[PDB]
Write an enzyme that holds these catalytic residues in place. Structure first.
Site, PDB file in Angstrom:
ATOM      1  N   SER A 112      -5.610  15.559 -11.738  1.00  0.00           N
ATOM      2  CA  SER A 112      -6.943  15.671 -12.055  1.00  0.00           C
ATOM      3  C   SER A 112      -7.488  17.575 -11.941  1.00  0.00           C
ATOM      4  O   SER A 112      -7.100  17.903 -13.155  1.00  0.00           O
ATOM      5  CB  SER A 112      -7.893  15.140 -10.654  1.00  0.00           C
ATOM      6  OG  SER A 112      -9.248  14.886 -11.210  1.00  0.00           O
ATOM      7  N   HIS A 153      -9.467  10.651 -15.777  1.00  0.00           N
ATOM      8  CA  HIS A 153     -10.037   9.493 -15.318  1.00  0.00           C
ATOM      9  C   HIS A 153     -10.856   8.989 -16.557  1.00  0.00           C
ATOM     10  O   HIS A 153     -11.937   8.548 -16.286  1.00  0.00           O
ATOM     11  CB  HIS A 153     -11.015   9.613 -14.159  1.00  0.00           C
ATOM     12  CG  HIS A 153     -10.532  10.735 -12.948  1.00  0.00           C
ATOM     13  ND1 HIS A 153      -9.294  10.400 -12.411  1.00  0.00           N
ATOM     14  CD2 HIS A 153     -10.703  12.019 -12.896  1.00  0.00           C
ATOM     15  CE1 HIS A 153      -9.036  11.706 -11.468  1.00  0.00           C
ATOM     16  NE2 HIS A 153      -9.988  12.504 -11.809  1.00  0.00           N
TER      17      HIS A 153
END
Lengths: 203, 203
Positions: A112, A153
């Protein structure tokens, strides 16, 4: 030069490192250090047989940052608040230390926020992570370890980052920046220029 | 199994084929066959030293589609109207012929609409190409040569496909389909499962 940039980890992280010792840089999540399910990231690496050497850059002078990064088989930059992680990296000055060590061949795994700071900028995730957590952060330039701007994501499977805002991110930053939509489970295996896009099953 | 799925071509197309003879399937652009700048695609391949064997599927019985595809070093599926190209592929029945030949190792280059039909579906580009050109097209399933759903011209650099509608495409199809944003100049080099994402400079 070896990078493995994951949206949220990947089963081949251990094989990518090629060793057992990984420096775990947690600072992106220092803003909720002991919050429930913040340890899930460390269990993912530990479940694959990795022994993690914690390296909190906010609490480490650069000489020791250098010493740990030379005693480990790889470095892992965990997810969290992207803008605070770059604030740490630039203020600490380990942005130069980590970048230098990565270019000398120390394998780098991003998750991330760890995957986004590896690229040219963190401005493309400003609709994902709040920039207000670093009000004194002037420059949004990333580490430049990759030219690809990872948008993690990308499936819209996280409630804080629904598909509407990933779409807004493409509307806002898609023209200037080479956006790369990564879904949870995917990762970019970058090795001496070649960029391989892996799904979960690629191992 | 060898695919090279480009947004709009790539400098290494000739090296990907490994030969000089490429079957050029133009049917995606049959709706404006002799329109100015429709030949730009054939010049791109010809500029790299490829001799193109035209194979218009709308005007070829499947026995001859089979014979040409066995006398060429590779196949190229040009851009145009994605929904009409799949209408051709399904009606002609060469969708089975091409898919069979690709899996036997015949290298496949896709450009725009050629890259999208290689994936699981063409429904994700319905805000890019009009589905009304094939009103009698019931099933939107693609060839399935790749599981990645290519979204070409992802930079927003084409006037017909601005960044607003690429963003709308992510909002609309990003959750179910593994969208892959390809900018003009990029291509996916897929070889026996491994997916490499190339920029212009990767050659």
């Amino acid at each position: 030069v070896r990078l493995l940039l994951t949206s949220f980890q990947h089963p081949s992280m251990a094989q990518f490192i090629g060793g057992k010792r990984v420096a775990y840089i947690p600072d992106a999540a220092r803003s909720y250090a002991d919050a429930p399910f913040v340890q899930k990231e460390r269990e993912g690496l530990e479940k694959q047989g990795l022994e993690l050497i914690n390296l909190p850059l906010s609490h480490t002078d650069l000489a020791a940052v250098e010493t740990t990064l030379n005693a480990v088989d790889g470095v892992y930059v965990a997810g969290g608040e992207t803008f605070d992680l770059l604030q740490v990296l630039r203020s600490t000055g380990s942005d130069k230390v980590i970048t230098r060590r990565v270019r000398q061949g120390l394998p780098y795994i991003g998750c991330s926020a760890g995957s986004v700071v590896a690229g040219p900028t963190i401005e493309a995730v400003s609709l994902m992570d709040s920039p207000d957590i670093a009000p004194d952060l002037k420059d949004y330039t990333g580490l430049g370890l990759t030219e690809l701007a990872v948008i993690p994501h990308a499936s819209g499977s996280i409630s804080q980052f629904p598909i509407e805002t990933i779409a807004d991110t493409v509307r806002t930053y898609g023209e200037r920046w080479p956006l790369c939509l990564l879904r949870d489970g995917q990762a970019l295996w970058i090795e001496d220029g070649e960029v391989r896009l892996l799904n979960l099953e690629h191992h």
